[PDB]
Design a protein around this motif. Structure first.
Motif, PDB file in Angstrom:
ATOM      1  N   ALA A 766      38.343  31.187  41.187  1.00 43.35           N
ATOM      2  CA  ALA A 766      36.948  31.383  41.561  1.00 43.35           C
ATOM      3  C   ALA A 766      36.415  32.637  40.943  1.00 43.35           C
ATOM      4  O   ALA A 766      35.336  32.653  40.366  1.00 43.35           O
ATOM      5  N   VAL A 767      37.205  33.686  41.063  1.00 42.29           N
ATOM      6  CA  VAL A 767      36.861  34.986  40.521  1.00 42.29           C
ATOM      7  C   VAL A 767      36.876  35.005  38.982  1.00 42.29           C
ATOM      8  O   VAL A 767      35.856  35.308  38.359  1.00 42.29           O
ATOM      9  N   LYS A 768      38.018  34.671  38.378  1.00 45.97           N
ATOM     10  CA  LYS A 768      38.110  34.535  36.913  1.00 45.97           C
ATOM     11  C   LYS A 768      36.916  33.767  36.301  1.00 45.97           C
ATOM     12  O   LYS A 768      36.419  34.129  35.236  1.00 45.97           O
ATOM     13  N   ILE A 769      36.477  32.701  36.974  1.00 44.51           N
ATOM     14  CA  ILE A 769      35.380  31.869  36.479  1.00 44.51           C
ATOM     15  C   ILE A 769      34.077  32.663  36.406  1.00 44.51           C
ATOM     16  O   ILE A 769      33.357  32.642  35.403  1.00 44.51           O
ATOM     17  N   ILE A 770      33.777  33.349  37.501  1.00 46.93           N
ATOM     18  CA  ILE A 770      32.553  34.138  37.617  1.00 46.93           C
ATOM     19  C   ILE A 770      32.536  35.229  36.579  1.00 46.93           C
ATOM     20  O   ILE A 770      31.518  35.462  35.935  1.00 46.93           O
ATOM     21  N   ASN A 771      33.658  35.918  36.452  1.00 46.32           N
ATOM     22  CA  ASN A 771      33.787  36.934  35.449  1.00 46.32           C
ATOM     23  C   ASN A 771      33.464  36.370  34.056  1.00 46.32           C
ATOM     24  O   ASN A 771      32.574  36.873  33.326  1.00 46.32           O
ATOM     25  N   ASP A 775      30.504  37.766  31.452  1.00 46.51           N
ATOM     26  CA  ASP A 775      30.832  38.067  30.064  1.00 46.51           C
ATOM     27  C   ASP A 775      29.921  37.297  29.111  1.00 46.51           C
ATOM     28  O   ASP A 775      29.227  37.877  28.294  1.00 46.51           O
ATOM     29  N   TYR A 776      29.860  35.982  29.255  1.00 40.05           N
ATOM     30  CA  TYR A 776      29.150  35.159  28.272  1.00 40.05           C
ATOM     31  C   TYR A 776      27.836  34.497  28.727  1.00 40.05           C
ATOM     32  O   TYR A 776      27.243  33.769  27.936  1.00 40.05           O
ATOM     33  N   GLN A 777      27.378  34.751  29.962  1.00 41.14           N
ATOM     34  CA  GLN A 777      26.022  34.340  30.417  1.00 41.14           C
ATOM     35  C   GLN A 777      25.059  34.486  29.210  1.00 41.14           C
ATOM     36  O   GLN A 777      24.356  33.543  28.769  1.00 41.14           O
ATOM     37  N   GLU A 778      25.111  35.678  28.632  1.00 44.55           N
ATOM     38  CA  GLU A 778      24.202  36.055  27.560  1.00 44.55           C
ATOM     39  C   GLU A 778      24.337  35.151  26.355  1.00 44.55           C
ATOM     40  O   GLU A 778      23.355  34.657  25.779  1.00 44.55           O
ATOM     41  N   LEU A 824      34.475  41.316  47.161  1.00 45.50           N
ATOM     42  CA  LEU A 824      35.029  41.688  45.859  1.00 45.50           C
ATOM     43  C   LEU A 824      35.576  43.087  45.927  1.00 45.50           C
ATOM     44  O   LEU A 824      36.710  43.330  45.556  1.00 45.50           O
ATOM     45  N   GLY A 825      34.756  44.008  46.422  1.00 42.52           N
ATOM     46  CA  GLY A 825      35.219  45.355  46.780  1.00 42.52           C
ATOM     47  C   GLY A 825      36.578  45.318  47.471  1.00 42.52           C
ATOM     48  O   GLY A 825      37.563  45.843  46.980  1.00 42.52           O
ATOM     49  N   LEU A 826      36.656  44.619  48.580  1.00 41.74           N
ATOM     50  CA  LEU A 826      37.889  44.586  49.347  1.00 41.74           C
ATOM     51  C   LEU A 826      39.076  43.961  48.627  1.00 41.74           C
ATOM     52  O   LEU A 826      40.181  44.010  49.151  1.00 41.74           O
ATOM     53  N   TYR A 827      38.850  43.340  47.469  1.00 40.60           N
ATOM     54  CA  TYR A 827      39.939  42.730  46.714  1.00 40.60           C
ATOM     55  C   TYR A 827      40.548  43.652  45.694  1.00 40.60           C
ATOM     56  O   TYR A 827      41.614  43.329  45.172  1.00 40.60           O
ATOM     57  N   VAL A 828      39.890  44.762  45.359  1.00 40.65           N
ATOM     58  CA  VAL A 828      40.418  45.606  44.282  1.00 40.65           C
ATOM     59  C   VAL A 828      41.754  46.139  44.687  1.00 40.65           C
ATOM     60  O   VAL A 828      42.625  46.230  43.857  1.00 40.65           O
ATOM     61  N   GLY A 829      41.918  46.458  45.967  1.00 40.83           N
ATOM     62  CA  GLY A 829      43.216  46.912  46.487  1.00 40.83           C
ATOM     63  C   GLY A 829      44.332  45.871  46.481  1.00 40.83           C
ATOM     64  O   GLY A 829      45.429  46.153  46.024  1.00 40.83           O
ATOM     65  N   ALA A 836      42.700  41.120  41.854  1.00 40.82           N
ATOM     66  CA  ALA A 836      42.236  42.513  41.841  1.00 40.82           C
ATOM     67  C   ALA A 836      41.619  42.900  40.508  1.00 40.82           C
ATOM     68  O   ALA A 836      40.467  43.306  40.457  1.00 40.82           O
ATOM     69  N   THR A 837      42.368  42.749  39.425  1.00 39.23           N
ATOM     70  CA  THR A 837      41.880  43.204  38.119  1.00 39.23           C
ATOM     71  C   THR A 837      40.651  42.450  37.651  1.00 39.23           C
ATOM     72  O   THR A 837      39.928  42.917  36.773  1.00 39.23           O
ATOM     73  N   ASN A 838      40.411  41.282  38.229  1.00 37.74           N
ATOM     74  CA  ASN A 838      39.200  40.531  37.899  1.00 37.74           C
ATOM     75  C   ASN A 838      38.040  40.886  38.779  1.00 37.74           C
ATOM     76  O   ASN A 838      36.891  40.852  38.316  1.00 37.74           O
ATOM     77  N   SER A 839      38.347  41.130  40.059  1.00 34.74           N
ATOM     78  CA  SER A 839      37.334  41.506  41.043  1.00 34.74           C
ATOM     79  C   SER A 839      36.690  42.782  40.552  1.00 34.74           C
ATOM     80  O   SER A 839      35.478  42.950  40.618  1.00 34.74           O
ATOM     81  N   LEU A 840      37.525  43.659  40.013  1.00 33.66           N
ATOM     82  CA  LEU A 840      37.083  44.920  39.458  1.00 33.66           C
ATOM     83  C   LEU A 840      36.188  44.782  38.215  1.00 33.66           C
ATOM     84  O   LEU A 840      35.158  45.491  38.069  1.00 33.66           O
ATOM     85  N   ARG A 841      36.603  43.898  37.314  1.00 30.36           N
ATOM     86  CA  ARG A 841      35.787  43.571  36.160  1.00 30.36           C
ATOM     87  C   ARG A 841      34.395  43.057  36.575  1.00 30.36           C
ATOM     88  O   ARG A 841      33.387  43.354  35.917  1.00 30.36           O
TER      89      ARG A 841
END
Length: 852
Positions: A766-771, A775-778, A824-829, A836-841
Motif C-alpha cells: 500500500a505504502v510502496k504504491i503511493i510512494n 515519484d512519478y505523478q508528474e 505514516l509518521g508512526l511507521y517510521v519507527g 518504515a523506509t517507504n513511509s519516510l520517503r
C-alpha cells in the motif's frame, strides 16, 4: 523437604549446559528432581495460615522472618490461586526478587528447571553414566512420571473452576484472562518437557524391564477423552517403545500380544479408539520381532490367528482413522505454499472419530507447537511407524485394497458416510500426506532409492485405480513433491518410470472435459479433478523453467479447455495455469491469447466501456473464479526482463502481445484494468469475511505495483508513442486517480496490523504504491498522459473522454487527510524496513510543501 527456590535449579542446569555437573549440588537436590513437578504433600494448609497471619514465619532450612501485610497478601494469593502450602509459598517469594507476583514465577521456574534437567539427563547422558544411574536408581522418578502428568491435568481444572468463579462474578476481565494464559502456558511447556522425559526413559530402557509400565501407561492414556490432543504427547514414548520391543524379555512381549487380542474382543474397546491404534501399531512391530528370532517366536505363532485376524479387527475398529488423525492434527501442510486443496478430503475420510483439540486449555489456543526436542522425537518415532507399516504390512494393504474394490455397488444412493465407511486404504494415503507434508528431510525417503520399500509402496499405490484411491494417491504425492528436489523426482516419476504418465493425467482431464460439456447438450468428479489439479499445481510451482516448460507442453492446452467449461474448479485451474506461465515475456503469448479468448468469446461488445466489463463479469461469476483469475493475471503481467538492478521493465518491452484482442475488440490491455479496478477493488471494501477480502486485495496490490514498475520512467527523467499507449502504467495511473481507488489504497495504510504477517505485506504494498505514484505523478501528467491523449491511436481501448481527474482529490485525501499522515509518521519507527523506509520517503515528499 525440598529446596523451594528456583536459583539452585537454574545454576545446576547451567552447569550441565557446558558439562560442569557438580555431583555436589546434584546430589543435594536429587530428591527434588525425582519429585518432578509434584508438590504432593505441602498443598494448602490452615495450620500454616495461622502461622503466617501472626507475621512471623519459619522455614524448614533453619532461619525465620518478620512478615508485613503486603507480603501476607501476595502469599495467600498464592495458596488460594495454586492450592499450595502457605510457608512454601513464602520461601518462594523470598527466593525471587519481591515484585508484583514474583512468587508465582519462582513456583513455575523451579518446576520448569527441574523437568528440563531430568529431561537433559535421561536423554543426553549415556545409560551407563554415573548420574543417569543415580537419578533413576531409587526408582522414585519412574513412580512419579505418571502422577506428574495427572497433576498438570488437575491444575488445568483448578484453573477452570477459578475461571468459572470469575465469570459468575463477571470479574472475568482482561487481566484475569492474562494471569491464566500465563499459567496455562507454563503447564503446556511442562507437559511437553514431560513428553521428553517419558521418551528418554524408554530409550534408556528403564520402563521396559517388563510389561507392567506399558499397561499402566496404556491405562493412563485411555483415561483422557478420545479427542484430547494431549494424547499426542504420549505418542513418542509409545511409538518408540513398540519399536524397541527387543529390549523387553520375550516372556513379556508374548504376554502383551495375548493381552491385546483379548482387548480387541472386549466390546467397549471401540469407544477407546486410541488404544485400538496403539495396539495395531504394536502388531505392526511384533511381526518384525517374531521374524528376528524365528525358532522361538515366529514358529510358535499362527499368522492368521495371532496377527492378521487381530490387525484386521483393529482396522475395522478405526485404527487407521486414528493414525490419520494423529497425522493430520500435527501436520504442517499449511506451510506448503504450493499445496492447495480444492475439496475437503479430511471430512470425507474422517467421519467416525473426532479431531483432536487441546480441550483442557479451551473454554485462546488455535494451533500448538511442540518443543524442538519434542518435535524431533515425535517426527522420528512416527516416521518409523509409518514406514514399518509400509514394509512389514503389505498383506494388510492388499487385503484392504481388494476389500474396498468389492464393497460398494454401482446403481445406489451412496452417502458420504457410506463412501467413507470402507475407505481405510485412502485414510492411510492421507496419513502419509499429512505427516510428510512440508517435511522434505523425510519426504525424500520415498524417492531416494528405487529399490526401497517406500519407492515400491508408491509404485503399488500408483496401480490402485479405484477413483477415490486414485485421487487420494494424487494428493499423497503432492505432499511428497515438497522440496525443489522432491518436486523434480515427482516430475521424473510420472515422466520416466511408471504406469501413470503426465500425458495420461492430462488425458483424464481432457476426457472429463468432454463428458462434462456433452452432458450439458457430480461429487465423484470434483474429488478426482480437484486432486488432479492439487497435484499439478504443487509440482509446477516447485520446479525450474525448463521443467515448467515441458509440463506446459502437456497441460496448457487441456487446462485451457477445462476452464471454458463451468465447473466449480475454474479458479483452481486458473491457479495451475498461472504456475505454468513462464518468465520470459515472449513465451507468454499462448497464455494471453487463451485468456483474452476466454473473456471475449461470448461477449457482446459495443461503444461503451461497460460492454467490456461485462465480458469479464459474465465469465468470472464467482469468488473463486476471480481469485484464480487474479493470480493468473498477476503472473502474466509480471516483470521478468528488467534493467540491470532497476525494478523497471527494460525500456521497450511488454508482458503481452501487441494489439491484444485484435480482430474482435478495441485492442490492448486497458479493459483488464477497468474490470480489476472498478468491478473488484472498488468493491472489496464490502466483501463479507476479512480473510477473503485480504485474499483478493493482495493480488491486486501486487498487480498495481507491478504495473507501476512496468515502464522505465527514468529514460525520460534522465512508435515509442505506441509503446507508451500499450503500457499498463497508463490505465493504472488513470484509475489510481479515481477516488474510489485511492481511498481503498489509503485505508490499508490507516488501519495497519489489526492474513496476520500476510496482512502486514498488504500494508507495505500500500505504502510502496503511493510512494511510486508520488515519484512519478508528474511524469504521468506531462509526459505520458498527453502522448496518449494527443497521439493515442483509436483502434485501441481508449476512452472517448480520457482526462486528468483527481489531482486535487488524491492530494487533498493524502495531504489534507490527516491520520494517514500521522499513521505514516508512526511507521517510521516500526521494525519492518520496507514499511518504515517507504513511509519516510512519502513524508519527505509531502514535507516539500513544508507547512500546514
Amino acid at each position: 523437604s525440598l529446596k523451594w527456590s528456583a536459583i539452585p535449579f537454574q545454576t545446576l542446569y547451567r552447569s550441565i549446559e557446558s558439562g560442569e555437573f557438580d555431583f555436589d549440588l546434584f546430589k543435594e537436590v536429587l530428591p527434588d528432581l525425582q519429585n518432578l513437578n509434584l508438590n504432593t504433600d505441602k498443598l494448602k494448609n490452615n495450620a500454616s495460615r495461622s502461622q503466617l497471619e501472626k507475621g512471623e514465619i519459619e522455614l524448614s532450612d533453619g532461619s525465620t522472618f518478620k512478615v508485613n501485610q503486603e507480603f501476607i497478601f501476595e502469599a495467600i494469593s498464592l495458596s488460594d490461586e495454586l492450592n499450595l502450602d502457605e510457608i512454601v509459598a513464602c520461601e518462594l517469594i523470598l527466593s525471587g526478587d519481591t515484585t508484583a507476583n514474583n512468587g508465582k514465577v519462582q513456583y513455575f521456574l523451579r518446576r520448569q528447571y527441574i523437568l528440563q534437567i531430568v529431561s537433559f539427563i535421561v536423554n543426553c547422558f549415556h545409560e551407563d553414566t554415573e548420574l543417569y544411574q543415580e537419578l533413576i536408581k531409587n526408582g522414585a522418578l519412574v513412580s512419579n512420571i505418571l502422577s506428574a502428568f495427572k497433576f498438570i491435568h488437575t491444575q488445568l481444572s483448578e484453573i477452570k473452576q477459578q475461571i468459572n468463579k470469575a465469570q459468575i462474578l463477571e470479574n472475568y476481565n482482561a487481566l484475569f484472562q492474562q494471569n491464566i494464559k500465563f499459567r496455562r502456558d507454563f503447564l503446556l511447556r511442562e507437559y511437553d518437557i514431560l513428553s521428553q522425559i517419558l521418551y528418554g526413559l524408554v530409550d534408556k530402557g528403564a520402563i521396559m524391564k517388563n510389561k507392567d509400565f506399558i499397561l499402566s501407561l496404556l491405562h493412563h492414556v485411555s483415561e483422557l477423552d478420545s479427542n484430547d490432543f494431549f494424547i499426542i504427547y504420549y505418542t513418542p514414548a509409545f511409538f518408540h517403545l513398540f519399536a524397541s520391543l527387543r529390549v523387553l524379555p520375550d516372556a513379556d512381549v508374548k504376554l502383551l500380544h495375548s493381552q491385546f487380542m483379548k482387548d480387541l474382543k472386549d466390546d467397549s474397546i471401540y469407544t477407546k479408539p486410541v488404544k485400538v491404534a496403539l495396539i495395531f501399531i504394536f502388531f505392526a512391530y511384533f511381526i518384525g520381532w517374531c521374524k528376528e528370532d524365528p525358532k522361538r517366536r515366529a514358529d510358535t505363532m499362527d499368522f492368521k490367528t495371532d496377527v492378521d485376524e487381530p490387525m484386521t479387527s483393529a482396522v475395522e475398529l478405526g485404527a487407521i482413522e486414528q493414525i490419520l488423525i494423529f497425522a493430520a492434527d500435527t501436520s504442517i501442510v499449511e506451510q506448503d505454499k504450493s499445496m492447495e486443496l480444492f475439496y475437503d478430503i479430511r471430512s470425507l475420510l474422517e467421519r467416525h472419530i473426532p479431531r483432536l483439540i487441546p480441550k483442557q486449555l479451551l473454554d485462546s489456543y488455535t494451533t500448538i507447537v511442540l518443543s524442538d526436542q519434542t518435535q524431533e522425537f515425535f517426527l522420528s518415532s512416527f516416521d518409523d511407524v509409518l514406514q514399518t507399516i509400509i514394509t512389514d504390512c503389505a498383506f494388510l494393504l492388499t487385503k484392504i485394497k481388494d476389500a474396498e474394490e468389492d464393497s460398494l455397488l454401482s446403481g445406489e444412493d451412496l452417502t458420504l458416510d457410506d463412501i467413507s465407511l470402507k475407505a481405510d486404504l485412502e485414510r492411510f494415503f492421507l496419513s502419509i500426506y499429512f505427516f510428510y507434508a512440508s517435511r522434505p528431510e523425510y519426504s525424500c525417503t520415498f524417492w531416494s532409492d528405487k529399490e526401497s520399500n517406500a519407492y515400491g509402496f508408491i509404485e503399488w499405490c500408483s496401480r490402485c485405480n479405484d477413483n477415490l484411491m486414485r485421487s487420494c494417491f494424487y494428493l499423497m504425492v503432492s505432499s511428497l513433491s515438497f522440496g525443489p528436489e522432491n518436486a523434480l523426482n515427482v516430475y521424473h516419476y510420472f515422466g520416466e518410470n511408471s504406469s501413470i504418465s503426465w500425458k495420461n493425467i492430462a488425458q483424464c482431464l481432457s476426457d472429463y472435459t468432454k463428458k462434462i460439456s456433452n452432458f450439458n447438450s457430480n461429487e465423484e468428479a470434483v474429488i478426482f479433478l480437484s486432486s488432479l489439479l492439487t497435484l499439478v499445481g504443487s509440482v509446477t510451482y516447485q520446479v525450474d523453467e525448463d521443467v515448467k516448460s515441458s509440463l506446459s507442453k502437456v497441460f496448457s492446452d487441456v487446462l485451457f479447455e477445462f476452464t471454458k467449461i463451468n465447473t466449480p474448479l475454474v479458479g483452481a485451474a486458473f491457479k495451475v495455469i498461472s504456475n505454468l506461465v513462464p518468465k520470459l515475456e515472449s513465451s507468454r503469448t499462448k497464455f494471453w491469447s487463451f485468456l483474452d479468448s476466454l473473456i471475449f468469446k461470448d461477449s457482446s461488445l459495443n461503444y461503451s466501456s461497460e460492454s467490456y466489463r461485462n465480458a469479464f463479469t459474465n465469465v468470472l461469476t464467482k469468488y473463486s473464479d476471480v481469485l484464480g483469475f487474479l493470480q493468473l493475471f498477476h503472473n502474466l503481467i509480471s516483470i521478468h526482463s528488467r534493467e540491470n538492478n532497476s525494478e523497471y521493465m527494460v525500456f521497450g518491452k511488454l508482458a503481452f502481445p501487441t494489439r491484444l484482442g485484435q480482430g474482435y475488440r478495441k485492442v490492448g490491455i486497458w479493459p483488464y484494468f477497468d474490470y480489476i479496478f472498478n468491478d473488484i477493488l472498488a468493491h472489496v471494501d464490502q466483501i463479507v469475511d476479512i480473510r477473503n477480502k485480504r485474499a483478493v486485495q493482495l493480488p491486486i496490490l501486487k498487480i498495481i505495483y507491478t504495473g507501476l514498475c512496468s515502464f522505465d520512467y527514468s529514460v525520460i527523467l534522465n512508435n515509442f508513442f505506441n509503446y507508451v499507449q500499450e503500457c499498463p502504467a497508463i490505465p493504472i495511473f488513470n484509475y489510481i486517480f479515481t477516488e474510489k481507488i485511492y481511498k481503498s489504497i489509503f485505508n490499508v495504510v490507516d488501519v495497519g496490523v489489526d492474513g496476520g504477517k500476510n496482512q502486514a505485506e498488504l500494508l507495505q504494498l500500500a505504502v510502496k504504491i503511493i510512494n511510486k505514484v508520488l515519484d512519478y505523478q508528474e511524469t504521468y501528467v506531462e509526459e505520458l498522459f498527453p502522448i496518449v491523449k494527443k497521439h493515442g491511436k483509436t483502434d485501441y481501448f481508449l476512452p472517448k473522454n480520457y482526462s486528468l481527474h483527481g489531482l486535487r482529490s488524491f492530494y487533498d485525501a493524502i495531504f489534507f487527510n490527516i491520520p494517514l499522515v500521522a499513521h505514516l509518521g508512526l511507521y517510521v519507527g516500526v521494525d519492518d524496513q520496507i514499511l518504515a523506509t517507504n513511509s519516510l520517503r512519502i513524508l519527505a515528499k509531502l514535507s516539500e510543501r513544508s507547512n500546514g
